[PDB]
Design a protein. Structure first.
Ligand SMILES: [Mn+2]
Ligand SMILES: [Mn+2]
Ligand SMILES: [Mn+2]
Ligand SMILES: [Mn+2]
Lengths: 360, 360, 360, 360
């Protein structure tokens, strides 16, 4: 089986909040097997180097031509080849690897998690981002998610308003939910070290379980200092833009927790390298997302199932934000977790009609 | 006097809780003197590289043949020879050295502690592990041990349940006992650094005297960071698997207290090297155990009696967990301490009948 | 397919030099497929914690019972389970993983290298150890190996004689061979830092390509200092006794090259974690061996074929030292390299007659 | 057996060069056994805190009164007591411990080396200091010592003349002796780091085997820097004025070799602690001296016989410098080594007549 064609399709899907743009990859092999992958980001170029437009242009012009003709069953050789011709471009690489893994899983009749070694679990805990902006509404949404047993871990995005306004908001939510939920924050690099010093103390003293990426990745020393002084543990996300960054942060002691994202590392196998480095250093894990649809979510999930331990769970709730999907199989969210079947590949198939309807 | 025969016998003894497996060593010398030693571990291979089965196989096939014929009175030459042919195998080496020291003590008419230089005390404070799992039962067992004046220092094994569940358990016990007892914990490498950050703070703020091995030995930086930030002092145990590890941790500032175990270092003389290194660095001491019976307990005790100071006492309570013993002389636990006589060798003799009864 | 039986057989084979002891593992699965593995060391306990006797005792008593009944096709779950019940025991784990990988390769019809991701090459460069002790003989053996195009990279084991005697020996060999061969040394931890200082300079100034493990693993600082001052690069071998050690050495900058041994890490998949860590740090690779027969050699080789780059080649020449083998398929050494076929599993089958003949 | 009396006698003996002052200790025990020790220095207060006069005054007024009445057979308890009442005073402590060890050896019928664990050798290599000041004479004395097979390792004391004058002297001696002798230097803290930089390079490039204490102990950073840059290894001597200093230097990486002196550490047992620390760090050893007579030399020797390895030999040639002695048994210097018998204690007895003749 050889790789015959690779198609990168930009799809705009409507959300429950506005749209979300996905780059769906379809890799057709000579044995008739097709693999599907996903390369998705948030806000064009605001949360990464790659935009949907940039991802497609590079796949069509550089990445895809390098793979047509190669053995579809030798994923390592294919991905190493891409590293030799292309610096970075991890989101694009992630979609490509996800698709090759899907095709290979269907070919051998095994779930991607088994291709990656074997799963140690069948479900993953999923956190939920309370994003209404209104404290009263957030507490209400949280009480609801707990009621229907969908989520018991909540994430708050802060950093866009005055520090003291965001702190009041977060402390109020943890105060009202109490021990019934785990409350965490994500500052998305918005604070400088001088603002984080007091903010991390207040949050830590008021029961916040972890503080995700409080300051910018450019401030390495600041990350090391905050890792040693904050009452609540520091998780790195944006600081990891490659597997080598993970080693660097580990060697430096810049964070006690690493967020694992297939898009930021280069695919399901790449994310496992990063996880392995963290494991060898004793750094805790968390399954992150770039708000992918079901393809990217399942591609992430299949890798996370092989991990010994994910101390802080995951946030694979991307499909729950989309009103319409492009696959036929809806993901199973039940009892605070996402459940992954033992079907071949990623266990998903495209809905040709909805795909054609939402493809731009 | 030459070494003529060395026998390694696996013995399964019943406990008050299940069984405990010991490897009893018998070294017979040409002058008719016999020395007895012990090499014991907990849970097969779960708490160390050496299992009872592995210990015996290596003694019979490699270690013992190297000693038959050598002067029984030159312990240094014998132990150095073993280091030259065998990497690691500290538990096995510990049993062998204990036996040679016992034989040499009987030969010269001196207690092993005197062979090791001279004792500065005749008794050692002994801590007790509250292991029922039930908080109410633990407090009750603790009140009892205080009542009969057997123990006033208590150790709790945590880390197998959710962090917050274990913290509640430990804080409740310290709350109810108050200043009448010293309460300490042992996490047995079960937490990662991200979990330990908050856990060490809560424990330290609630009167826990020390936190033993909170995180894995693989996380060196984490140990150094926790040593600088935890309100309660950090004790290293599993991180020491040799005398050289002790130097490394001392040079790094990875712990302010070292647990001393003859099995983890290579014998009574080896444990003294580790203690000496700690002393030269200003690191506090604690007499640890691998739940040995009376032979291994006394072998440890004889070395600990020579120490200038053991700030945190010891936990030489192993014989109290066994319902049956293989020696004739029961250890004296009285007034919160273990008392060591001034009899030759380890001051113990085998009970041939019980030995034959429990030997597998 | 479930794991039904696991047999650990000690086999003594004759060498061209004396014997070599192997522990052959046979794992039988419920679908009729059998996987074979190997756990071998050099000199009993002289080059590691595990002896052939210790390896078998632990497999029979602890490791094997934990696997009987588990899915043979979920290697990750099986190996993670072993890490949970057994500390260390990497040689034993390496044999077990090699066997599971072999069985799984035969089951799916793929070579182990493909199970591990996909090979990027079909052959590996192989170095040869000149071990006659006589300089004149060594040069002769080297000229011969170059003549028949079997080896062009030579390794010298030094450290057992006076420093200046070993230096003369090594310099003479490089002097006479010139640019036709690559000459490297291995000191096997025999020098202390004070001896290595001058020795590394002389060797480096006289064309020796690399210096393998000059000083003991206990001297970490010394390794860091030698890594910064020696004219010839420093390779770590004995310092790596686990994947976590590799991270530590990388973070410390203790060596610019890592020797990769499946036995020291825990198996083919484990050695890949170590290699990944090195790659993320920019550390060069070398395929090492513990003088394994064809099973262990091929198990190592299949993992090394997936690596992007092995700057310093390999030393997979173990089968060339044995006069008799226990497999039917002889390895192909041709044109300075070892060639690996694309047959299922490790591509080897046992010779039942020679096995029964050499099994102790 | 209790300690009844301790006498500190100042004795002035004539040398082959001038006199050498010794402080002979005689400890009489209630069982009739007497132990002899020695506390000696060079040049009053020029090479240490303690002078012969200061040593005696402190023994008579503070140290001795603290021991009268204690068990003579519990050396550990006695020495620990002294550490509790007296800061430093290592030379004095060294004499006292040597005497207690001698008495205890005679009491049990064992050589001190056996009390310390057991010897691994019966002789020690001895270096010789060429001190005539004249290059031509030094070469001649060296050729002679090689001829009669007394010494093959030579030490040169430099630093009192202009750097370039001393360098010429040392290089000429190594040039003329060639590979027949090992040439080493001792700068006795005389250079500052700026002078040592070039001097260490010249010496290292011209075959000098090691450079002993080139700069002052006050310059720690300078020692660390020279340890990393000098072509020839750096040995610490004056930097060690206690066992704790040894740990500090080891942790810092200030030297690759440690000189072991009983007088600088506190006695035979104390020097073993220092040696153990070095061993755990991978630092090479050398048996040093303070130009002691036979009592102090043998007291040092008995401890050095227990050491696994002394890479750079010893310099126990003190008795060869004295024309008259105060003991009856002359030391055996033969075939480049000092030979130690297996007689009880230090194996020496006082010559009452010569003692009374040279006692001041
Ligand atoms: Mn984030
Ligand atoms: Mn412990
Ligand atoms: Mn090697
Ligand atoms: Mn000196």
């Amino acid at each position: 089986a050889l790789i015959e064609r690779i198609d990168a399709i930009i799809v705009d899907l409507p959300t429950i909040r506005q749209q979300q743009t996905l780059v769906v990859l379809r890799v057709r092999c000579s044995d008739g097997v097709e693999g599907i992958g996903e390369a998705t980001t948030v806000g064009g170029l605001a949360y990464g180097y790659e935009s949907p437009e940039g991802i497609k242009a590079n796949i069509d012009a550089h990445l895809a031509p390098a793979l047509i003709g190669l053995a579809a069953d030798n994923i390592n050789a294919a991905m190493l080849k891409l590293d030799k011709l292309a610096k970075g471009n991890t989101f694009a690489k992630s979609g490509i690897e996800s698709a090759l893994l899907d095709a290979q899983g269907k070919r051998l009749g095994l779930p991607v998690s088994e291709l990656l070694g074997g799963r140690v679990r069948d479900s993953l805990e999923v956190a939920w981002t309370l994003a209404s902006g209104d404290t009263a509404r957030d507490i209400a949404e949280a009480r609801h998610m707990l009621e229907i047993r969908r989520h018991r871990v909540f994430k708050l995005k802060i950093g866009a308003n005055p520090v003291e306004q965001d702190l009041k908001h977060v402390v109020t939510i943890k105060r009202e939910l109490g021990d019934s939920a785990s409350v965490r924050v994500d500052v998305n690099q918005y604070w400088d070290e001088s603002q984080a010093i007091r903010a991390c103390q207040v949050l830590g003293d008021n029961g916040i379980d972890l503080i995700e990426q409080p300051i910018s990745r450019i401030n390495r020393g600041g990350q090391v200092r905050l890792n040693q002084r904050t009452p609540a543990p520091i998780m790195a996300d944006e600081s990891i833009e490659s597997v080598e960054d993970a080693f660097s942060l580990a060697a430096d002691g810049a964070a006690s927790i690493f967020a694992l994202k297939i898009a930021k590392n280069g695919g399901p196998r790449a994310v496992l390298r990063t996880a392995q480095i963290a494991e060898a250093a004793g750094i805790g894990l968390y399954g992150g997302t770039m708000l992918e649809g079901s393809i990217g979510t399942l591609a992430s999930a299949h890798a996370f199932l092989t991990l010994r331990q994910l101390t802080w769970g995951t946030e694979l709730f991307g499909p729950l934000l989309l009103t319409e999907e492009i696959v036929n199989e809806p993901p199973q969210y039940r009892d605070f977790q996402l459940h992954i079947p033992r079907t071949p590949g990623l266990g998903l198939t495209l809905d040709e009609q909805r795909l054609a309807r939402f493809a731009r």
